[PDB]
Structure formats: C-alpha cells, structure tokens
A paper describes a structure:
The T-cell receptor (TCR) recognizes peptides bound to major histocompatibility molecules (MHC) and allows T-cells to interrogate the cellular proteome for internal anomalies from the cell surface. Here we explored these issues using phage display to generate a high affinity TCR derived from the MEL5 TCR specific for the heteroclitic version of the [name]*0201-restricted primary melanoma antigen recognized by T-cells 1 (MART-126–35) peptide, ELAGIGILTV (A2-ELA). This TCR, α24β17, bound to A2-ELA with an affinity 30,000 times stronger than the natural parent MEL5 TCR, resulting in picomolar levels of binding.
We reasoned that, if α24β17 TCR binding required a conformational shift in the peptide, then more energy would be required to reach the same final bound state, thus explaining the lower binding affinity. These data discounted the possibility that alterations in the unligated conformation of the Ala-substituted A2-ELA peptides could explain the sensitivity of the α24β17 TCR to these single peptide mutations.
Numbering used by the authors:
A (entry chain C): 1 to 10
B (entry chain B): 0 to 99
C (entry chain A): 1 to 275
The structure:
C-alpha cells in the first residue's frame, strides 16, 4: 500500500 | 543540469532459432533526464506496436525502460534499436548480434 | 532470503506543454505490481502483477486516491523548487521520490527508506534512524526545517515500520509462487576471435531471479575487474534476468581465465573454465 501520511510538500 | 547517457542493449528474450517465435528487447538504462526516444527496427524500418515498461529508476536516480516486440528471427532479417537522448549528438543505433 | 517493497515516483515539468508528467510504480523485490501514469486514459492505479489483481475495490479506490495526492504534492514541489533555486519558468525539471521497506528472511523489519531527488541529484533523505534528515544542500535545509516543524519523520516512521511491512508480507503470501522463488542462472561462456591474436571471452548468466548477481573474471586466480566489460542486469521480459561480462584476451591464454558466478539460487558459487 502507498503511504497515507508523511508525504509532504518540500 | 545533470545528464547521463543511456546504456543500450538489444537482445532476444530466449536464445534465437530461425523460424521460432521470440521477443526482441531493447533495454535502455542509466539515463537522465527521462525524455528519450527508442525504436526497434527491422531492416532499418521502424516496428509499430512495440511496447514499453513503465518509467522507473535505479538507486542512483538514473532511469531505465524496456522496449519489446514479439518476433521470429530469420537468416536475412536485420534487427536494431535506435535511441535518441539529449546526451547523444545524433541517434545511436545498436544492431542485434545473435552470436554474442 | 530478504524482501523489499519500494514505490518510485517521477514528476517532470513541461512548461507550455501541460501540467507535469507524473509516473508512479510499485515493486516487490524485482517484480513490478502497480502503476499510475498521469497521461493515461484511466486515471486509475492499475495492476501490473497477476497476484495483485485479487485486491478489491476499496484497495484500488484507496490507491488511486493516495497516488493522485502524491502527484498533486509533486506538482507543488516543482513550483517550490524553482523558487528555491531561482530557476526560470521555461526549463523542464525532474523530481524523484522513492520510499519503502526491507525485511529479512524471517520477514522481520530490517530498515526503511524515504529519499528525494531534484534534477537527478540527492535532495533530502530520511536517515536510517527514521527520525532525522540528511539534506544535501542549502535549499534542502529549508525543506528539512519545514519537515521537522511538521513532524513528517514521525509520520513516515509509522508507515515504514508498520503498514509497509504488513502489506509487503500480505503481497509475498498472495504472490508466493511468483515472489518467493529463486531461479538459478543458466551459465556458459562464449569465445569469438576479434583478430589473429585476440579473442573475446563472454560469461553469460541467463533466466535468473532475483536480479542480484555477481559475475567476475579471474586470470590465474586474480580478479580482472579493470579489464572486464560488465553489462547492466537486464530484463528478459518474462520475469527473469540476464547479465554478461567479457574480457578480450590473447589467443592461447584462454585456459588462464575463469568466470565466477554468484547468485542466491546457486547451491554453491560456480566457476566456468575453458578446460
């Protein structure tokens, strides 16, 4: 599964 | 900008046997940026319905792609792969060599 | 032995020629199982492995959701990074993200990873502790600052230590015939004259899985790594891999040379000889 949290803009 | 030159490999999926169906592959790896043009050629003519893998990349961030088509080899038919990329001053054509 | 799950994301800006291109792919070890392409018709995460096709609608809907959210954040990033590096609007630029987890032969967690590149160079990367960042230049320090204040490392640790490992276990089980296999290489050496006094010796490994392999030439026991041409491991297209290594040697000396092959599916490392 892909991450649902923690993928943030730079 | 970083630029990395594609490494081009043309080869069959299984050991080639004249008259027996097979797959012709052109693998391009180690390249950057991603914009690239790859054609499989039969006697210098572009083969339509070549399929390709989805853009992925290595630990070093360089990209790779597999182009492929089903084919049956013969004694006279010459196969190649033609690649263009910003790092090449003209398209590079790699001939399929069945006796490597 | 060991397994991994890794997701790969590429966004490419294309000023005047549309919104950025976004491609995502998921792998278990060397087996692709999902893709998303922003330019395809479906606008859906799609199966690329037979064994993933079992997953139900909640799955595909969820994974389409999240993948598009990844895409829209990378689209923002392209604009941001232009600002950080004072670059022009006219140039095409590339953002890359990869994250995932490795488990050992007992399917226990070894480590997690989450790394990001801008224009083909490291940008920022989560350290092995899963609590701190390695920022590879001054702009990336700005990102580090914002991600520290936003507690992003803690969110990723939770996914990487838990969810990632749980689903990787699920997939390994569901795809077990494809994924929990070893296909040992089929090996041989070819010999061709290049002239009157030199021959090319090429050591082949074929039909193997997984892709990790070592091919090496020795002359009288000594590694020839400086004079060896080693091609990149390449897909056959059927789930297996191929590789070769070649040296050009003086005619009459073939018997000094041996090829050595190392792969997980070999009961022992192999030595091929010209005698």
């Amino acid at each position: 599964e892909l991450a649902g949290i923690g993928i943030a803009t730079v | 900008m970083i630029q990395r030159t594609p490494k081009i490999q043309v080869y069959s999926r299984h050991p080639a046997e004249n008259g027996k169906s097979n797959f012709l592959n052109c693998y391009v790896s180690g390249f950057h940026p991603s914009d690239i043009e790859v054609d499989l050629l039969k006697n210098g003519e572009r083969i339509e319905k070549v399929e390709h893998s989805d853009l992925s990349f290595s630990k070093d961030w360089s990209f790779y792609l597999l182009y492929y088509t089903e084919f049956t080899p013969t004694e006279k038919d010459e196969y190649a792969c033609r690649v263009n990329h910003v790092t090449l001053s003209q398209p590079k054509i790699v001939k399929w060599d069945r006796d490597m | 032995g060991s397994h991994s799950m890794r997701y790969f994301f590429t966004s490419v800006s294309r000023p005047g020629r549309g919104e950025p291109r976004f491609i995502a792919v998921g792998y278990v070890d060397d087996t692709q199982f999902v893709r998303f392409d922003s330019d395809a018709a479906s606008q859906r995460m799609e199966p690329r492995a037979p064994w993933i096709e079992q997953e139900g609608p909640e799955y595909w809907d969820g994974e389409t959701r999240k993948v598009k959210a990844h895409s829209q954040t990378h689209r923002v990033d392209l604009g941001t990074l232009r600002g950080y590096y004072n670059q022009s609007e006219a140039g095409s630029h590339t953002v890359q993200r990869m994250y995932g987890c490795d488990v050992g032969s007992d399917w226990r967690f070894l480590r997690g990873y989450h790394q990001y590149a801008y224009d083909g160079k490291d940008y920022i990367a989560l350290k092995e502790d899963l609590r701190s960042w390695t920022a590879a230049d001054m702009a990336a320090q700005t990102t580090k600052h914002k991600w520290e204040a936003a507690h992003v490392a803690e969110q990723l640790r939770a996914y990487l230590e838990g969810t990632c490992v749980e689903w990787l276990r699920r997939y390994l089980e569901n795809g077990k015939e494809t994924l929990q296999r070893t296909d040992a290489p089929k090996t041989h050496m070819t010999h061709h004259a290049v002239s009157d006094h030199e021959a090319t010796l090429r050591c082949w490994a074929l039909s193997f899985y997984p892709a990790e392999i070592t091919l090496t030439w020795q002359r009288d026991g000594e590694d020839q790594t400086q004079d060896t041409e080693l091609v990149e491991t390449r897909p056959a297209g059927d789930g297996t891999f191929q590789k070769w290594a070649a040296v050009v040697v003086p005619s009459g000396q073939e018997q000094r040379y041996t090829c050595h092959v190392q792969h997980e599916g070999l009961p022992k490392p192999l030595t091929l000889r010209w005698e």
